[PDB]
Amino acid sequence: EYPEEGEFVVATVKRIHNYGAFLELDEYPGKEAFMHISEVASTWVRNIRDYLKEGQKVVAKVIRVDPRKGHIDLSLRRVTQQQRKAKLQEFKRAQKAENLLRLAAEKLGKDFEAAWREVWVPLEEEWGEVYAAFEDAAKDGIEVLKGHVPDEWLPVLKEIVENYVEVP
Amino acid sequence: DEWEEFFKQEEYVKIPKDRIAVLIGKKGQTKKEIEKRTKTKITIDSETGEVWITSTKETEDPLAVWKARDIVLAIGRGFSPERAFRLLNEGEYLEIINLTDIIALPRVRGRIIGRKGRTRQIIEEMSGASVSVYGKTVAIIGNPIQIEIAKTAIEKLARGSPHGSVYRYLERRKKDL
RNA sequence: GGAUCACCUCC
Numbered sequence: 001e002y003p004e005e006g007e008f009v010v011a012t013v014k015r016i017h018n019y020g021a022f023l024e025l026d027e028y029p030g031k032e033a034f035m036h037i038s039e040v041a042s043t044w045v046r047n048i049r050d051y052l053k054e055g056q057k058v059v060a061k062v063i064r065v066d067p068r069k070g071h072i073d074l075s076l077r078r079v080t081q082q083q084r085k086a087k088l089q090e091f092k093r094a095q096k097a098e099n100l101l102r103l104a105a106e107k108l109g110k111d112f113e114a115a116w117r118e119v120w121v122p123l124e125e126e127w128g129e130v131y132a133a134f135e136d137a138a139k140d141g142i143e144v145l146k147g148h149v150p151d152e153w154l155p156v157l158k159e160i161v162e163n164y165v166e167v168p
Numbered sequence: 169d170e171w172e173e174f175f176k177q178e179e180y181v182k183i184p185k186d187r188i189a190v191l192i193g194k195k196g197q198t199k200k201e202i203e204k205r206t207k208t209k210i211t212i213d214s215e216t217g218e219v220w221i222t223s224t225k226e227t228e229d230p231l232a233v234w235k236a237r238d239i240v241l242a243i244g245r246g247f248s249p250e251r252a253f254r255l256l257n258e259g260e261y262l263e264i265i266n267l268t269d270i271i272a273l274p275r276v277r278g279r280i281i282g283r284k285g286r287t288r289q290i291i292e293e294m295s296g297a298s299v300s301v302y303g304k305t306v307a308i309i310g311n312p313i314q315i316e317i318a319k320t321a322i323e324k325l326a327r328g329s330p331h332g333s334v335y336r337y338l339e340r341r342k343k344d345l
Numbered sequence: 346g347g348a349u350c351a352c353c354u355c356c
Binding site: 186187188189190191192193194195196197198199200210212214243246247248249250251252274275277278279280281282283284285286287288289301325330331332 | 351353355356
Binding site: 010056057088091092095096099102103107159163164 | 174231
């Protein structure tokens with residue numbers, strides 16, 4: 001429901017004020033975060049608009065998170081090249097996993113809310129990254145998922161991962 | 169560039185030199201059909217055989233990059249474009265077997281093909297799969313059941329089974345319907 | 346039939 005302190009997130013700039021911006025988090029639907037003017041760049045920022053446009057997509061670090069109040073603070077300056085690159089790879093792999101899962105759902109006649117609840121959530125909890133679950137299944141057999149997801153998902157998840165996810 | 173950085177899916181393969189001509193096609197028509205039919209963008213290096221397949225803003229099928237990539241490999245492993253286009257059907261996959269991993273090579277090829285390609289044709293008819301024999305690989309298009317039947321028969325022929333028992337094997341599997 | 350075949354060929 002909320003990201004963790006130190007997590008990198010994809011976010012979209014929604015509003016810009018003189019000393020900060022509000023962003024919506026792409027991976028946490030409807031969750032908004034603040035980005036203070038002092039976290040926008042490693043040099044001094046005179047005008048935020050020199051760095052942010054409404055609608056712009058950004059990788060940002062989570063610097064403060066208060067779940068009881070639902071406050072989230074982000075920083076753009078603290079993200080390194082390497083961290084941007086990793087997060088972006090990880091985001092693109094989450095789009096694959098989701099597409100793979102939508103396909104398995106269509107094949108099995110389950111709606112997407114079910115696929116999320118029966119496959120996505122538990123796989124994310126356990127491997128940290130759903131694509132990683134799939135990578136394990138590709139390397140060692142679909143049985144690695146046995147126990148985490150309903151048995152009826154195994155045959156079709158098996159066909160899809162075997163044909164679409166490379167062993168690392 | 170926002171899209172490039174956050175959404176573009178890209179795959180990279182390398183097909184043998186003498187299949188490059190076929191992938192491109194007269195006036196680029198073949199590459200253009202793959203592009204059209206998958207809404208992807210395909211880049212071919214005429215010298216080295218490297219191919220790049222990427223999504224576009226227009227791309228509508230989320231798995232399309234992978235389908236295009238597979239058609240590229242099929243063409244690379246001996247299928248004609250027409251035959252490789254089978255891979256656009258739902259639930260049909262490409263499987264590439266390395267002969268050298270089973271086994272003399274030229275001989276095994278000729279046992280799979282059979283006199284006048286009778287063996288290949290019987291395997292295709294009985295398994296329901298498409299088969300291309302080319303260089304050091306045999307490539308199969310079909311659904312997983314079709315693939316497993318052809319795969320097994322081909323492996324039997326490589327490991328030295330007489331043709332008779334292979335056909336009888338195929339006869340057995342079809343009869344399981 | 347008794348084990349090499351057919352189609353596709355530089356954007």
